[model samples]
Target: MIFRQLFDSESSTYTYLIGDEATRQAVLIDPVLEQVDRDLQMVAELDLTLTHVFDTHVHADHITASGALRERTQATVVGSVNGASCANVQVRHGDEVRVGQLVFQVLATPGHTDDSISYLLGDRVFTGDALLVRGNGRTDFQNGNASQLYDSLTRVLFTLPDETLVYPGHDYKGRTVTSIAEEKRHNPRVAGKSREEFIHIMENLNLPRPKLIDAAVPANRACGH
Candidate 1:
């Protein structure tokens, strides 16, 4: 198995590459529009065949490279069923995506957005804007729902094994991955607070909107032009 996490400094976004070295089959997740070249070059250098491209959600901070990558490599683009306009594979909860020996189970975890989803591969979960390191996603925009987020965290995400690894969508501090044990034990928003309290805190906090929201959404919804 091969896994590489690429960080985008401009938006603090993460683009992941997961592959089976033996089979030379790989998948790219949440790739940035501007960084597609780098990802493609890495895939080539690693002697991997890009087969699937996964988008966790329609991002509000940066454009996605799904469409461009598809055009370049003919890789299938996987995303939520609600994302029909953008993705080639309209995945739902319980849907399984296979790339060589790697299998990814889809979990519909809506909160930051109504169409948000998380991908679970083995013991690792790629949570996109749903649960961050210490803070949760703000629910003030883009169909954000506090209650839905709480349920998704408690009922869906938190149900995973404590040892499961968590790969967040973005991190400004350069942290790469975290474990479910660590998050459950220390994540202030979900671990230490009641659902009601969580909602109250989310509603009262004045977090800044993503800088590129206006430009990112439209392009991202169409897979970055």
Candidate 2:
């Protein structure tokens, strides 16, 4: 397998590129519109075929490159069923998306947004904004619900194997990644907090509205064209 973790500094978003060495077929997860050229360059330099684009959810912080990439590469766009209707493939929980020999199992991890989902591929889980390094996305918009986010943290995500690596969509600090075990033991919000406690914390975060929400949200719904 060939993998590269790409970052968009503007939104602190992480886009992942995964390719099967044997088939040379690649997929990009959570691509940022501003970094499309860079992503395409990497795929070309690596001698990989861009086959699919996956958006964990319709984002409000940054525009997605799914539409642009699809136009350039004719790649299929995959997103949660509850997300963009423009997606070539709308997935639900338990659905498996195959790109070359890699299979990504969709896990509905909504809470950050009703369409939020995590993709489990082998030992790594790409958690959009639902689960971050030490903190999770603020549940203050896009139909976000603190209590629902709590369940996603304690029930859906926490149920994964301890060794599973967590690749979050955005990281404000310099942190890049974390493991399920590490989060379960050290995550300040959900590690030991009860559901109600978790809810209280989420509700009180008082995070400012995303700077690009006004434009990003609607653009993302159309896959960022």
Candidate 3:
């Protein structure tokens, strides 16, 4: 297995490339538009063939590179059925995407958006805008609901094994990854908090709207329109 993490300084967004080294087949997760060339170059350097691109959601922070990658490599684009635009496969909860021998299971976890999802691969999960390193996604944007997000986290994500590794979509502090155990034990927003408390915390946060939302969403929906 091979894994690469690419970070965007502007939005603090993280994109991932996971692949079977032997087969040279790979998948990219939550890629940013501006980083497409860099990502493709890495793939070429590794002698990997891009097979699938997964957009965790229609991002509000930056345009997605899925479309450009698809055009360059002819890879299949995958995302939530309800949220994805122009995807080759519209995945639902429990849907599985295979790249060579690797498998990615989709889990519908709508809090940040009605179409937000988390992908589980082996012992690692890639959560896009649904859960972060020390906090959860803000619930004030499109289709965002605090109660729904709480349920998604507690009922869906929290049920995963404690050892499961968490790879979130973005992190301002430059932390790359975390674990379910670490989050359950130390995440300031959800750890040991009641539903009411969690709601209060989410509601009280004065987070600014993502700067590129207006341009990112429309372009992202079409996988880069």
Among these predicted structures, which one has the highest TM-score?
2
What is candidate 3's lDDT per residue for 51-80, written digit by digit as tens? 999988888988888889889899999999
Candidate 1 matches the true fold with a TM-score of: 0.97
- Model 2, range 41-103, lDDT digits (tens) per residue? 999999999999999899998999999999999999999998999999999988999999998
Candidate 1 deviates by what RMSD? 1.1
Per-candidate Cα lDDT values, in order, are 0.89, 0.93, 0.89
TM-score of each: 0.97, 0.98, 0.97
Best-first order by TM-score: 2, 3, 1
Tens-digit lDDT track for model 1 on 174-200?
788888888888888888889899899
Q: How many backbone clashes does candidate 1 have?
A: 0
- Candidate 3 lands at a TM-score of 0.97
- In candidate 1, the residue pairs with backbone N, CA or C atoms under 3 Å apart (3 or more residues apart, or in different chains) clash, namely none
What residue runs in model 2 are displaced by over 4 Å at the alpha carbon?
A: none
Output the better candidate (2/3) by TM-score: 2
Better of 1 and 2 by lDDT: 2
Question: Global lDDT for candidate 2?
Answer: 0.93
